[PDB]
């Protein structure tokens, strides 16, 4: 629970260190049954407030199974096609639709609510009955609607056929919106109870059991809900839970901002600026580097995120933060006359790149503004700062307990001449720049030889 | 219908072909209607518990109207174009605001639950009266909370209005956390009974109603609801539903991946991609092309596109695939020396761009590892493959039955000199990069042709 | 109320006038409460129905406890959008922090306390299932017998745990932070209220009253703190510093020459599109559709997300070659149509073969496009078709004005001109002509010094 930072004022830029991985790298499926009723439109004659309350409820339900049967067949459409983050519990859906492999799970919890079954292409599966309307409806709907007169319902069971009811009209209700797949898992789909004993289930080692049982609410946000199928009246989906195969190694977060040259006026400065900037995790001796925000998740120290949102680097992408004009790794830099000001806002600190006549302020809640940034590219820790102000844009400060260290360097922009600096790199790296930078220097001496004999 | 895919080694690229076209070409937009009571708060003295629960319903009834009463506006408003998806319902809200509007559509739903009502700007609209709210509160409701004596309702009136309120509730809910806008279209604001009623009496063929009719979760995801208005009792908001004026024509999808050369130096490549990825359908003699793939949604074969994000092409940008140096089109690529790995998944199959020091490989579930990829861009096919890893990275293969053809061609980036090379195209073309070898190859003979005579 | 636009056709862009802004500048953290009950599982034995039906609504509410347990916590700048919330949500986890909100609420609903840091922030609360779980339910199950409630009472039940578990289940898909705050968040009332109570403008308060839908789009609802028979979550409304300044819209499309032989046409762009609204002096500038909401005249849009300018960045609008400002261009030989909606019109830019319409929905086709960058109002039209893409056009009322103009393209050498500045400006781009008529007259000098 250390987070530390370090800003290196030679590349405006900084990493926040001391997290813990947890990166997804398998895929557990279940099956999540539910069962239903095979039950018609009733046929009884009668008309108190109470049955009609039966009887719309009932209509609900037959509603909701037909429109889940239209999202089957519309191998449902939504099933084969697209996926890869799918993939695996599509498969598991597919096969559920084979002669007789819902009878294979209908045995298994006959007798029990949670069993785990194998299915016929050769995958095992937890499965479990979630929500069983067919014995309610039969031993305490069907005796009171078939027949020719209706006998009246007590009002505790018409109250309590709508709260069972409710689960099966909400999933059909995020069912036939999402097209069958849907993420996060919704509690609809499965509660924080079915989720946590569904976790106590998996061949997962205990401490996995740990990361994920304390972080559910990550582990929704990482897994889907795929919907299988309607038959034999029952309904079958299969949630797909994330396998963090990657657990408490190190992650780091790296914050970049521009770097440009101050002295000079108008439109007549170089900038530079790091742009790998997102997510790194040490993973199987090399580093996983998440480039979207939205892929990785953060709870206090742990960093969750999925593999295949991800690009592998070696090692030696580190040598960027200690020493960017490294032999080992080419580190990549983009380029422009653009001079303008911004901040970010970092784990623990700000980065603010204060350029022209900008004024750029730090603040606290009681002291007012207790920095002014010149010129240049600075930087700020949250130790009694609250806000940063970058012209008419006050952000606030992450109030988050950890060391800051300022890294002293000559900011790497003042090394390069302005007159052959390649100021439209969209993603260059340091030697690129160089190559760029010889070729310009060559063709100054190219034509200069050419003004010998000449001039 | 049968998928199909090719691969061109030449080029990096693959073509998924044998998907049907349903392109979303225009809007059509009807009138959805509740009718309410204007009751005022109850001003019965009496206490019972039951009173109370329908006085605290009828709150929750008085502050949906009054909250809804607060939303009462719609809206305001390969690089492409720039659309406004909800112009077309904003436009139909905008005539229901006038006055003695909303008068027309009472009149024409006195004796029917659905007709077609004429409004001033000549918008002639279909209008669906979907809850009557006022017939239950003002007969069922009103007499028990009239008078001062509270005749004492039995428990199921209390949980009748319960029911019969929350549809109104939770429209007013999904508009209150949406600025009155809201899609995909949820069963609340139209029931799929509803819906289907409505594309049945849509200005379209035999064949685009069915599309719509098994497909009605991508038609809820292509839907937008607008709040429109709260007054004379009414609540109306306008339903805009999509308009499929192109179907049946085929479609397929390019896949591309970078392809630079295999030489064993730190940076020394150059690199070369397609940048045409994306859908392509035929319509009317040209192609419409999708450059992003989220304006895209398949269903096993069908593919669902908004037009609002599309390119027109002729029908020659499909030469590309052919042969990329064809003269009647000009394709589009981009260049860099940006040197990585990385890997598409194909309809049924994967490319992999192997580069450098990176394990890639393709593997079966029981097999192992069936290939390991040497540096370059190749193709595999779905037939005997489950997985593809490149990296710490493991993408699923599409296990989707279809044929695969591999095209063998030699590597274009090989014809190119890597020092007249523009090795920094961000948006080009093959006649545009000649354009620009030309230059390079002209201007360095000419300074050498100019060096020779200075004897 | 009144929108005006102008098309000038020198530039290919369009500027809508006449809007009012409303600037989210800060964040006003402020704390809401529900009130819980340490109810433990009856242990007493039933089988009526409707004892049933209280021990299965008590799970529900202890089930959401324990769950809620767990949930407890042009290129820009970069921020950290619920920072404020979030450093008010770690201050409640201070012990004596609870409790003095807890005390401070012992006898009314809406209470300010100054926290061990010393912010005054609103405190409300808004349930309160300790009083009725305690007094209403715990007679019938803290005994043996388990006495058989009556229906009623089912009901009540049903109703106060209902805001408690959808409050959860906001919360469990959402990681602790949801954003737009839900009605089961805040609800109308106590959002109105904490407007009224708020130390804002009068005009601040009848800004935000009147645009509750916005204010709940630009919110946040974050999940804090439970203990003590206390559930407290943090709601952060947005700050409105900056209101009632004039706005514009600027709506840009590609100008390109005319020349029939395909490849051989140059291509220019403003890249200044976006919302602009005075602040202060300088010019708040949002370049994201994403960040500006409008309701009417009046523009929504957060500061977290824009560049200041000099206020002078409105001389491109009148004259793109003004000395005061370099206005940003981009340019590019690729001759392709597109159409932009603007706020009370459209603009075409047909090139090539391609067929651009503007249609109204019973007289038929009203204008049609030959090559170059035209406008055409929304008076009259009703769509506008460009290739196989049909646009509607928005329908808002509002004049336009066509100023007519030279198109800029028609003033360069296609031949010196650099046709691939991804960003620029005007002044760049005659830096680089300047540039290559130097060299190519270096070199003619050259060629006559050796003839």
């Given amino acids: 629970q250390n987070i530390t930072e370090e800003f290196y004022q030679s590349t405006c830029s900084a990493v926040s260190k001391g997290y813990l991985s947890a990166l997804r790298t398998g895929w557990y499926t279940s099956v999540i049954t539910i069962e239903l009723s095979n039950i018609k439109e009733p046929k009884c004659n009668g008309t108190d407030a109470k049955v009609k309350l039966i009887k719309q409820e009932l209509d609900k339900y037959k509603n909701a199974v037909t429109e889940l049967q239209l999202l089957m067949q519309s191998f449902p459409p939504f099933l084969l096609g697209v996926g890869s983050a799918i993939a695996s519990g599509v498969a598991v859906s597919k096969v559920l639709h084979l002669e007789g492999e819902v ?61 069972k009811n409710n689960r099966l009209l909400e999933i059909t209700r995020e069912f036939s919106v999402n097209a069958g797949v849907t993420t996060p898992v919704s509690t609809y789909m499965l509660t924080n109870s079915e989720l946590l004993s569904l976790i106590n289930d998996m061949p997962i080692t205990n401490d996995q059991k740990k990361l994920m049982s304390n972080n559910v609410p990550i582990v929704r946000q990482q897994s889907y809900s795929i919907m299988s199928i309607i038959k034999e009246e029952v309904l079958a989906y299969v949630v797909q839970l994330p396998l963090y195969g990657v657990i408490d190694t190190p992650c780091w977060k790296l914050h970049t901002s521009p770097l440009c040259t101050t002295n000079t006026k108008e439109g007549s400065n170089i900038c530079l600026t790091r742009t790998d900037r997102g997510w790194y995790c ?148 340091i030697s690129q720049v160089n190559e760029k930078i010889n070729q310009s220097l060559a063709f100054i001496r190219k034509s200069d030889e050419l003004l010998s004999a000449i001039g």
């Fill in 103 to 163: 009878n294979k799970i209908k045995s298994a919890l006959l007798s029990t609510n949670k069993a785990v079954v194998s299915l016929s292409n050769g995958v095992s599966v937890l499965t479990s009955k979630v929500l069983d309307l067919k014995n309610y409806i039969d031993k305490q709907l069907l005796p009171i609607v078939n027949k020719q007169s209706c006998s009246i319902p007590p009002i505790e069971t018409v109250i309590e056929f709508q709260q």
């Fill in 282 to 429: 040490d993973n199987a001796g090399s580093v996983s580097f998440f480039p979207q925000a939205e892929t990785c998740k953060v709870q206090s120290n742990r960093v969750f995120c999925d593999t295949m949102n991800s690009l592998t680097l070696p090692s030696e992408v580190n040598l960027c933060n200690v020493d960017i004009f490294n032999p080992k790794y080419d580190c990549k830099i983009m380029t422009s006359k653009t001079d303008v000001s911004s901040s970010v806002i970092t784990s623990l600190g700000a980065i603010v790149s204060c350029y022209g006549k900008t004024k750029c302020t730090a603040s606290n809640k009681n002291r007012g503004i207790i920095k002014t940034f010149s010129n240049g590219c600075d930087y700020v820790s949250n130790k009694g700062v609250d806000t940063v102000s970058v012209g008419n844009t006050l952000y606030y400060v992450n109030k988050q307990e950890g060391k800051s260290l300022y890294v002293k360097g000559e900011p790497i922009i003042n090394f390069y001449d302005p007159l052959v600096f390649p100021s439209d790199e969209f993603d260059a790296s």
